[PDB]
Amino acid sequence: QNKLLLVSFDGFRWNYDQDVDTPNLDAMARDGVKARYMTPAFVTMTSPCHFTLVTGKYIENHGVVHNMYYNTTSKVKLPYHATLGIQRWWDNGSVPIWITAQRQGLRAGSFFYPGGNVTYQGVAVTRSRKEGIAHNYKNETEWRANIDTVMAWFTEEDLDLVTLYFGEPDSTGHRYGPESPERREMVRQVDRTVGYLRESIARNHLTDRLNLIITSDHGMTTVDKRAGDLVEFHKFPNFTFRDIEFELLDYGPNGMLLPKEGRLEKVYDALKDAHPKLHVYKKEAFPEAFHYANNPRVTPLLMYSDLGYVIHGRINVQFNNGEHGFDNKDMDMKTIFRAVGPSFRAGLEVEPFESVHVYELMCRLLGIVPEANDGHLATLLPMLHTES
Numbered sequence: 334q335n336k337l338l339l340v341s342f343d344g345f346r347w348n349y350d351q352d353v354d355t356p357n358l359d360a361m362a363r364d365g366v367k368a369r370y371m372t373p374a375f376v377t378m379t380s381p382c383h384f385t386l387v388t389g390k391y392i393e394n395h396g397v398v399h400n401m402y403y404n405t406t407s408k409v410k411l412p413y414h415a416t417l418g419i420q421r422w423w424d425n426g427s428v429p430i431w432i433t434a435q436r437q438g439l440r441a442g443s444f445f446y447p448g449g450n451v452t453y454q455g456v457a458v459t460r461s462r463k464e465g466i467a468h469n470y471k472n473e474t475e476w477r478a479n480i481d482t483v484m485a486w487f488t489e490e491d492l493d494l495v496t497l498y499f500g501e502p503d504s505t506g507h508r509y510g511p512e513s514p515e516r517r518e519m520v521r522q523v524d525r526t527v528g529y530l531r532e533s534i535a536r537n538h539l540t541d542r543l544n545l546i547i548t549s550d551h552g553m554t555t556v557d558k559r560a561g562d563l564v565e566f567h568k569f570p571n572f573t574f575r576d577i578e579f580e581l582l583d584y585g586p587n588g589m590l591l592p593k594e595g596r597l598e599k600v601y602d603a604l605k606d607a608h609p610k611l612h613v614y615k616k617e618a619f620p621e622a623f624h625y626a627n628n629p630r631v632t633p634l635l636m637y638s639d640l641g642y643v644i645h646g647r648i649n650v651q652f653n654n655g656e657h658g659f660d661n662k663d664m665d666m667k668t669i670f671r672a673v674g675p676s677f678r679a680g681l682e683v684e685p686f687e688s689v690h691v692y693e694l695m696c697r698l699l700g701i702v703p704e705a706n707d708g709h710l711a712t713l714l715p716m717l718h719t720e721s
């Protein structure tokens with residue numbers, strides 16, 4: 334059987350390669366498969382979208398509905414890195430691909446991949462690595478070292494599956510913006526890594542035995558600070574934080590709210606028209622096309638703002654030049670899907686598809702029984718050769 338290596342570069346917008354010299358990605362497009370663009374799951378956050386890739390489920394169904402673990406009763410809200418170690422957040426009734434594969438005789442590994450450093454129903458990933466709290470995500474030398482480790486897992490630890498995560502170009506896109514020269518420099522670094530990745534596959538005699546997927550979780554868009562009609566809760570006349578028992582704001586264009594007992598209607602009628610670029614819903618009325626709201630963890634009130642606008646709560650504390658989390662229909666949020674290997678055709682470009690379908694493909698590539706999921710294998714099966 335063929336091994337599988339899934340690689341994710343966080344926040345790689347579908348067209349980041351169009352205004353950058355990317356020789357190695359162009360070559361991989363010649364040698365393998367490429368989607369015009371891939372539509373991510375909503376919300377377009379790092380952890381929810383990554384867990385979709387390894388479960389084949391929409392976010393409302395696998396339960397990881399936010400980068401931050403939160404608990405409305407206790408008021409705890411843990412940042413992204415801390416949440417990577419909260420077992421109950423990820424082990425909420427869905428089984429990621431590492432565990433499914435290991436229950437069927439395979440050995441799987443996770444390198445910095447979200448959700449890959451916790452147990453699921455008592456089962457641990459065969460090999461797992463998690464970065465430090467102050468990790469540097471753009472050290473190219475450290476990238477090559479991690480790839481060396483991954484190759485050792487395949488060859489010397491007899492692993493059949495590995496999911497490898499990189500935190501760029503997301504970090505750079507946030508700080509400098511997705512249209513900046515810094516981002517393009519980071520995409521050039523990504524492209525040099527793609528080459529090194531394929532170079533390492535060949536050195537280890539795995540070219541004809543290992544399938545490679547290079548994808549990402551979401552895109553990136555510019556946050557214009559010049560704009561004057563900012564979404565600021567502290568300037569809503571009829572709203573008051575005295576009516577709120579729990580809040581999750583100041584986190585991009587997505588907000589959650591739990592009003593105090595009996596004040597839901599008061600809070601809602603005030604916010605439904607507070608700003609023409611903030612869309613506030615009761616949990617039951619949130620559009621179903623997002624496949625996000627129907628989960629017990631979601632609060633009675635949730636909201637999202639228009640492209641290029643973040644949500645400011647009690648006071649403005651956000652300063653990123655680029656952001657994500659917006660409607661997954663927006664082109665700036667679309668991301669990439671690239672693949673090459675013995676199972677994959679060559680020179681093929683397919684029309685766009687939702688990331689919910691990657692899981693079914695990976696299970697077919699591994700030859701394992703998939704968990705029930707929201708995807709359909711027929712979507713991506715045209716990517717693969719016909720067996721004889």
Ligand SMILES: *[C@@H]1O[C@H](CO)[C@@H](O[C@@H]2O[C@H](CO)[C@@H](O[C@@H]3O[C@H](CO)[C@@H](O)[C@H](O)[C@@H]3O)[C@H](O)[C@H]2NC(C)=O)[C@H](O)[C@H]1NC(C)=O
Binds near residue numbers: 449457461462464
């Ligand atoms: C989450 O990731 C951490 C790594 O950041 C995992 O911890 C690592 O676990 C492995 C296996 O238990 C340890 O490797 C062992 O090291 C000892 C001593 O070097 C050696 O005798 C063994 O042969 C093996 O190589 C590794 O030291 C350890 N590192 C740290 C920093 O904890 C952890 O297992 C992961 N957790 C889950 C739930 O996946």
Ligand SMILES: *[C@@H]1O[C@H](CO[C@@H]2O[C@@H](C)[C@@H](O)[C@@H](O)[C@@H]2O)[C@@H](O[C@@H]2O[C@H](CO)[C@@H](O)[C@H](O)[C@H]2NC(C)=O)[C@H](O)[C@H]1NC(C)=O
Binds near residue numbers: 469472473478
């Ligand atoms: C960029 O990263 C390299 C690599 O760091 C080493 O390998 C990583 C995978 C990590 O797991 C650690 O084991 C190591 O720190 C750094 O290069 C090392 O730097 C130290 C000095 O701090 C030196 O003693 C080592 O010999 C170096 N190793 C190599 C292979 O060059 C480098 O310092 C980092 N640079 C920045 C700016 O972050």
Ligand SMILES: *[C@@H]1O[C@H](CO)[C@@H](O[C@@H]2O[C@H](CO)[C@@H](O)[C@H](O)[C@H]2NC(C)=O)[C@H](O)[C@H]1NC(C)=O
Binds near residue numbers: 404406421
């Ligand atoms: C969310 O937070 C609440 C508040 O602390 C937790 O409720 C407590 O749960 C423990 C055991 O889990 C009980 O012994 C306490 O009596 C509970 N306290 C209250 C005030 O209800 C709850 O367990 C947390 N849930 C998660 C998933 O972390």
Ligand SMILES: *[C@@H]1O[C@H](CO)[C@@H](O[C@@H]2O[C@H](CO)[C@@H](O)[C@H](O)[C@H]2NC(C)=O)[C@H](O)[C@H]1NC(C)=O
Binds near residue numbers: 396424426
């Ligand atoms: C998934 O997580 C949710 C919440 O984190 C769990 O729901 C809680 O379930 C307990 C009892 O089972 C209730 O007392 C809490 O009020 C529930 N909280 C919420 C927010 O619904 C749920 O049990 C978890 N499911 C699995 C399969 O782990």
Ligand SMILES: *[C@@H]1O[C@H](CO)[C@@H](O)[C@H](O)[C@H]1NC(C)=O
Binds near residue numbers: 570571
């Ligand atoms: C706030 O509520 C008062 C009370 O009805 C109303 O007169 C006013 O128009 C409201 N303002 C906004 C911006 O909704």
Ligand SMILES: C[N+](C)(C)CCOP(=O)(O)O
Binds near residue numbers: 378380413
């Ligand atoms: C760690 N990281 C910043 C590179 C990526 C994940 O963080 P986030 O911006 O998606 O919340």
Ligand code: NA
Binds near residue numbers: 350351355
């Ligand atoms: Na290019």
Ligand SMILES: [Zn+2]
Binds near residue numbers: 343
């Ligand atoms: Zn991300």
Ligand SMILES: [Zn+2]
Binds near residue numbers: 344379503504507657
């Ligand atoms: Zn981000």
